[PDB]
Amino acid sequence: LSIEARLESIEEKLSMILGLLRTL
Amino acid sequence: LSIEARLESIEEKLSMILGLLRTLNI
Amino acid sequence: SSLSIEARLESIEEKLSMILGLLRTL
Amino acid sequence: SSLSIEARLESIEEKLSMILGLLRTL
């Protein structure tokens, strides 16, 4: 994938991690 | 979104996650 | 900084995955 | 956004490593 797509995918994963930490 | 901007967002979230683990968790 | 941006991206993606995996099993 | 994309990525990589170490200790 392109660098922009990988950054967008990386941002999505950080959002998922944040949600898990808030609800842990 | 530009690369520098998208990076800034990512960097924002990492500092938020790093701060919670280091101090808030007990 | 010898490593290519893509290579650095792959390392970041791997670390994210490991982080998520550990978080989910908690 | 003064720093270069390669340096910012490396910094982002570093923070990810710190986050993984903190999560495992919990």
Numbering used by the authors:
A (entry chain D): 170 to 193
B (entry chain C): 170 to 195
C (entry chain A), D (entry chain B): 168 to 193
Give verbatim lines from the article.
The essential polymerase cofactor P from Pneumoviridae is a multifunctional hub which interacts with numerous components of the viral RNA-synthesis machinery. Pneumoviral P interacts with both L and the nucleocapsid, thereby tethering the polymerase to its template. In HMPV and RSV a central oligomerization domain facilitates the formation of P tetramers. In summary, we have shown that HMPV P is a highly dynamic protein that is composed of a stable helical tetramerization domain flanked by large N-terminal and C-terminal IDRs that sample a large volume in solution and display varying degrees of preformed structural elements.
Although we were not able to grow crystals of a complex, crystals which later proved to harbour only the P oligomerization region could be obtained after extended time periods. Serendipitously, we obtained two additional crystal forms of Pcore with improved resolution, allowing us to build a higher quality model (100% Ramachandran favoured). The first crystal (form 1, space group P21) diffracted to a resolution of 1.6 Å, while the second crystal (form 2, space group P212121) gave rise to diffraction data up to 2.2 Å. The P212121 crystal (form 2) grew at 20 °C after between 132 and 185 days with mother liquor containing 25% PEG 3350, 200 mM MgCl, and 100 mM Tris, pH 8.5. Diffraction data were recorded on beamlines I03 (P21 crystal) and I04 (P212121 crystal) at Diamond Light Source, Didcot, UK. In one of the tetramers within crystal form 2 we observed a single, solvent-exposed helix which possessed markedly blurred electron density and, as a result, significantly higher crystallographic B-factors than the three other protomers of the coiled-coil (white arrow). This suggests that, in absence of packing constraints within the crystal (as is the case for this solvent-exposed helix), the protomers of the Pcore region are somewhat flexible and there is a certain degree of malleability of the tetramer interface. Alignment of all six tetramers from crystal forms 1 and 2 and the original crystal confirmed that there are small-scale breathing motions within the coiled-coil. This is fully consistent with the overall lower buried surface area (~4800 Å) and predicted dissociation energy (~21 kcal/mol) for HMPV P than in the more extended paramyxoviral coiled-coil oligomerization domains. For comparison, the buried surface area and predicted dissociation energy of the Nipah virus P oligomerization domain have been reported to lie between 15000–20000 Å and 140–200 kcal/mol. These data indicate a flexibly associated tetramer of HMPV P protomers.
